[PDB]
């Protein structure tokens, strides 16, 4: 009467613009983007990982 198995799973993300199978990512913030189009509206306010402690 005891168990402890963690269903090994992976993380899947989708374009943060249209939410579709991202073919490429931003060479800055590394965001999911299908085509340049979706990347356009992004680049505008593309905010990469700011220097210093942010996430961890
Ligand atoms: Zn997209
Ligand atoms: Zn970016």
UniProtKB/Swiss-Prot annotation:
Complex formation: Thyroid receptor interacting proteins (TRIPs) specifically interact with the ligand binding domain of the thyroid receptor (TR). Requires the presence of thyroid hormone for its interaction. Interacts with NUFIP1. Interacts (via HIT-type zinc finger) with the RUVBL1/RUVBL2 complex in the presence of ADP.
Give the organism, scientific name.
Answer: Homo sapiens
Protein name listed in UniProt:
Zinc finger HIT domain-containing protein 3
So which disease is it linked with? PEHO syndrome: An autosomal recessive syndrome characterized by progressive encephalopathy, lack of psychomotor development, severe intellectual disability, early onset epileptic seizures, optic nerve/cerebellar atrophy, pedal edema, and early death.
User: Which stretches are transmembrane?
Assistant: none
Specify the taxonomic lineage: Eukaryota, Metazoa, Chordata, Craniata, Vertebrata
* Residues that hold Zn(2+) 2 according to the record: 26, 29, 42, 46
Protein localization = Cytoplasm; Nucleus
Zinc finger regions typed HIT-type: which residues? 15-46
Q: Which residues bind Zn(2+) 1?
A: 15, 18, 34, 38
């Amino acid at each position: 009467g005891s168990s402890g198995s963690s269903g090994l799973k992976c993380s899947t993300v989708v374009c943060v613009i249209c939410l579709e199978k991202p073919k490429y990512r931003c060479p800055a913030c590394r965001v999911p983007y299908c085509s340049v189009v979706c990347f356009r509206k992004h680049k505008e306010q593309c905010n990469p990982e700011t220097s210093g402690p942010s996430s961890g």
